[PDB]
Design a protein around this nucleic acid. Structure first.
Lengths: 129, 52, 187
RNA sequence: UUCCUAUCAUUGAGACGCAGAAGUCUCAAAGUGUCGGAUUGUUCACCCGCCAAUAGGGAACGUGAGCUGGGUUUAGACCGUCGUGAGACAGGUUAGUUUUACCCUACUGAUGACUUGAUACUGCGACAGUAAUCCAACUUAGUACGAGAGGAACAGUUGGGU
RNA sequence: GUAAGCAGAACUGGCGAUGAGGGAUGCUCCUAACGCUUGGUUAAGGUGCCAAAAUGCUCGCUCAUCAGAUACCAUAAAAGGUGUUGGUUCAUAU
């Protein structure tokens, strides 16, 4: 039931990986709840579930299609209090087929709208926004 | 709760019918022909099935 | 095709009938119905001894001959209307969820709550000349009473249409409301 | 850009070897929608994924004074097979020019003469075009139904896609 | 030959070389073949209006939520219908 946020990452983007599962990278491949536009690259915002490969990381964790969630975003978006947040870097977390995160600890900041949706990623986060 | 007396009344409108073979129209228990235009007033009917 | 055909109708005692043109007023003690028959090619005319109402058509083809007896049955219903009324008893049926039914009895309207565990409320106004008593002492029953048949028996059927199951097998889920008995009140 | 329906999805029904959920069959239905990529010049095909669904077609096998020129189909050259040879191949391979609208109509926009006078303001609305459409979450509810696993819907609330 | 406004023959008649009237429209179908014309009569085909002539007369059948409507000709079938109108032949009024 997420509110719209500017979409900062198209399908092609290669982002950083927070958690202790051992992946350095996450290369995005598709997005959950993407409909139908001709020629539009499907893109993901803060907060939301995706699909990904790891490009470098632990060798069992490579060449598979994992689900991830997106946690920081360098593209700017408007909070309703009337200012524009934007983080330093794009980053995400490797996740199970339910929606739970795989590896428990989360480095970096996280967004408000990650912690607002997903209960588990709120707890393990160091400091939100 | 079913109630056996009321189940006779309830099954009368729902179960105790006939069916057109061709257009699937729900019919009275003692029809000969279907009433509809598109099956051609066809006289191939059957009983509406009932659970055991 | 056929040269002549004439059935006749017995008028009972406490009624009066005034067929000017095709249109037939029936006044009795309880109320009065008027009804028009300007479809049918037919000569309605009552008798010298004025508790009998003959009705006839010349030159009736075999399709149109079948409208002589349709007249009689409608006019007979108008008589037993204005004497005796037409009570239609309807009974509620359900498995789990008891269906909760209220009445603005003069108006009248029938809100139907909690049909098959639902939250949508289902108001059904009746036609002008018919009322709805909730029948006391017998559990779960609605009695629909009025002078006309076609006004009452629509108004009964509209409640059946409102309270209908969808998206599920109708043979198992018998949860509804149905006409039990056609009758009169007075006897 | 529009059209068709022999309807994949969405709307309202009917039938079942329909308990629920999930489906299969049929009727009214063309109002709305039918996607992102890897390989191939491909049309087709086959995979990875999403999705309510990724249905099939027509309009000079729609569409080159609209583009592109990868393919096919000139001239250069290479290989294999065939031919004594020049040469040949619905065999493979690489390199190879895509011209003109200012005419008529059409379509899209712009002024504009005149009609029981001139000139100014407020109007009427024949006729033509039309626009909205799908999904998810929260409660409804671990309720109905079921031996159990599983597991709905309407009204209400809140968002998202196109 | 699956068939074709396909290919190849036999008899006669046309079109080609040919208009006029009809078939809305059509080289080949129908009537009918042509010097310039006045009057009369028909042919094929038609008579609600477009359109010259019948909303003529007389007797049946048909109601279509895709009626039907004129040879060649511009498509329709197997199989159904307790829709209606008649017929044929058995069995007790149906």
């Amino acid at each position: 039931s997420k509110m719209r946020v500017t979409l900062g990452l198209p399908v092609g983007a290669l982002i950083n990986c927070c958690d202790n599962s051992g992946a350095k990278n996450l290369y995005i491949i598709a997005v959950k709840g993407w409909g139908s536009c001709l020629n539009r690259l499907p893109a993901c915002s803060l907060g939301d579930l995706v699909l990904a490969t790891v490009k470098k990381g632990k060798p069992d964790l490579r060449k598979k299609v994992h689900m991830a969630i997106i946690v920081r975003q360098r593209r700017a978006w408007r909070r309703a209090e009337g200012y524009f947040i934007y983080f330093e870097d794009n980053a995400g977390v490797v996740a199970n087929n339910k929606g739970e995160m795989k590896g428990s600890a989360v480095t970096g900041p996280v967004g408000k709208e990650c912690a607002e949706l997903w209960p588990k990623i709120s707890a393990a986060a160091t400091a939100i926004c | 709760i079913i109630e056996p007396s009321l189940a006779l009344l309830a099954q009368k409108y729902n179960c105790e019918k006939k069916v057109c073979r061709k257009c699937y129209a729900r019919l009275p228990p003692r029809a000969t022909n279907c009433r509809k235009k598109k099956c051609g007033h066809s006289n191939q009917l059957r009983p509406k099935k009932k659970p055991k | 095709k056929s040269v002549y055909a004439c059935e006749t109708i017995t008028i009972p005692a406490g009624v009066t009938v005034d067929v000017k043109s095709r249109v037939v007023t029936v006044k009795g003690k309880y109320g009065e119905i008027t009804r028009a028959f300007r479809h049918l090619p037919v000569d309605i005319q009552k008798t010298k001894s004025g508790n009998r109402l003959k009705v006839e058509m010349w030159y009736g083809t075999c399709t149109d001959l079948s409208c002589i007896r349709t007249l009689c049955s409608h006019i007979k219903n108008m008589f037993t209307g204005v004497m005796k009324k037409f009570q239609y008893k309807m009974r509620f049926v359900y498995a789990h969820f008891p269906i909760n039914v209220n009445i603005s009895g003069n108006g009248t309207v029938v809100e139907i709550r909690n049909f098959l565990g639902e939250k949508r409320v289902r108001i059904v106004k009746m036609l002008p000349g018919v009322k709805c008593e909730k029948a006391t002492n017998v559990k779960d029953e609605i009695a629909l009473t009025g002078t006309d048949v076609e006004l009452v028996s629509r108004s009964a059927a509209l409640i059946h249409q409102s309270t209908l199951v969808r998206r599920k097998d109708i043979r198992k889920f018998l949860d509804g409301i149905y006409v039990s008995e056609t009758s009169t009140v007075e006897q």
